Structure 1
Amino acid sequence: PHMFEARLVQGSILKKVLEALKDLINEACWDISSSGVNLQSMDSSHVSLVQLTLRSEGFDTYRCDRNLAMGVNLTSMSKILKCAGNEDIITLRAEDNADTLALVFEAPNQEKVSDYEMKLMDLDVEQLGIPEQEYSCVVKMPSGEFARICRDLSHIGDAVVISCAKDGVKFSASGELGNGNIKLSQTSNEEEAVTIEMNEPVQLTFALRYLNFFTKATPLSSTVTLSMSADVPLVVEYKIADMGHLKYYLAPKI
């Protein structure tokens, strides 16, 4: 009794989720309930926050008797998920007062099963709360294009200015080599679209080194959404299959 178990057929979702977290967040609390898996954590600088949601429905079987909170070293967990093949069925199992998580990997079409037992840890955890927000500008664009832009501008400077207007969205940086602007225009013609919805024009400045951690989520989705308003953190959102999302929040520079 008081036992969590969840079976995910696309084990690679979970491998990719941990590669998209482990370099930004060392260790976090996984909040498990009957609605699903929730994770919320600031990086140690408190400049950025990550929000992961995986709904119960995404799992091929899912049981959560009692709510629980597992403290996980994300680096430890990423190392264990590297022993899963990309098409393994992955089961997570935990007892409600347990010091360990069990991970079972079933190789598809093959009599091979792997079992790992990972030690948990106890974790102090601030609870942040983000309210409902109307964003002055929302940009949907290919995830590969955003990853390219953040990588390329990081060779020009440490900071990017993001401007949204009617024409479209512009990304700018400058440094000791010179200056760069990249302009994406709204696409007239599904995945390849750049879509801008804006109420008021916005211009914010952000640290490129954090954006380059966010784009480690690029394998989870072929698109990304950027949401911006004049005095508040940027949101960068990647959708995960049809079962949830990974959201990155980043405080603007000054």
Structure 2
Amino acid sequence: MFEARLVQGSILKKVLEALKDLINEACWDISSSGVNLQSMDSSHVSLVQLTLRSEGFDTYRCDRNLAMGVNLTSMSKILKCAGNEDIITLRAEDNADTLALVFEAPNQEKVSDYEMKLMDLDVEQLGIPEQEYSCVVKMPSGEFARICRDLSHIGDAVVISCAKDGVKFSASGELGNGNIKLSQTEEAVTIEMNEPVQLTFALRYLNFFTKATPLSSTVTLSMSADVPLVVEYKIADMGHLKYYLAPKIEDE
């Protein structure tokens, strides 16, 4: 028996909102320590890592480790039937050719229960022992989000540039070019660096990543020369959602 009672179903619903477009089918890794999802997007470009640790839940029970094949789109389609304050529980048993999701309206008075068939998938891994980063930036999720949305009106790629004197998102296109700055600081931005850096990323995928904005009011950009950008959304003393994206070779 795997069963997890999560009080805020919103977190789940959102998580799938931040996934379904980037990933179609995935195998959640459900163990004692928590629920993991590690998958390349359907174009094999960006790496996605979701960790929900047993702690952040309220009820967490996993007997035998199991691997749930599921279509994130279907699952999201199910979670759309859940209210935002609805307490949500996932329950699958052993063999588990299907999964059950129960939504309790708060105050109760209403209970909804669905089950979706599962798919036989295998695994992911994609471990990434990682490292310290020559640069890291904590900033409002929404801000970064619209930085991306707007600059995607100029170039098809943004150049992020980092020194403790601020941060700069530049882009250029047939329309001409534009350059955003920040300048440091409850909110806004911090920077931590052992070294300044400049990299070039595709706004398409970043704009995918910003779909997780509703999770944390803060996002974290981690980058080092010759290391993929890791954009970071913290989930509620629960887990985290990481997006890995390889920088362009010539900025420039």
| TM-score, normalisation: structure 1 | 0.96
Structure 1 residues 223, 57: closer, same or farther in 2, change over 3 A? same
- Partner of 1:233: helix, strand, or coil? strand
CA positional deviation for 1:60: 1.2
Q: Deviations over 1:183-214 (max 9, x none)?
A: 11111xxx323101111111110000000010
Q: Deviations over 1:123-142 (max 9, x none)?
A: 25443220131211000011
| TM-score, normalisation: structure 2 | 0.96
Q: Distance in 2 between matches of 1:244 and 1:129?
A: 16
Q: Distance in 2 between matches of 1:120 and 1:39?
A: 15
Aligned length: 249
Q: Distance in 2 between matches of 1:167 and 1:110?
A: 52
CA RMSD, 1 decimal: 1.0
Structure 1 residues 54, 126: closer, same or farther in 2, change over 3 A? closer
Q: Deviations over 1:92-123 (max 9, x none)?
A: 00011111000001111132111101010012
Do residues 105 (structure 1) and 72 (structure 2) align?
A: no
- Partner of 2:102: helix, strand, or coil? strand
Q: Distance in 2 between matches of 1:150 and 1:134?
A: 25
Q: Distance in 2 between matches of 1:126 and 1:240?
A: 22
Q: Is the 8 A contact 2:164 2:192 kept in 1?
A: no
Q: Deviations over 1:63-112 (max 9, x none)?
A: 10111110010000000000000011101000111110000011111321
Runs of 4+ residues deviating >4 angstroms:
none
CA positional deviation for 1:45: 2.1
- Partner of 1:58: helix, strand, or coil? coil
Q: Distance in 1 between matches of 2:107 and 2:59?
A: 19
Q: Distance in 2 between matches of 1:50 and 1:39?
A: 8
- Partner of 1:220: helix, strand, or coil? coil
Q: Deviations over 1:202-254 (max 9, x none)?
A: 11100000000100100001101000000011000001111110000001123
| Other-structure match for 2:36 | 38
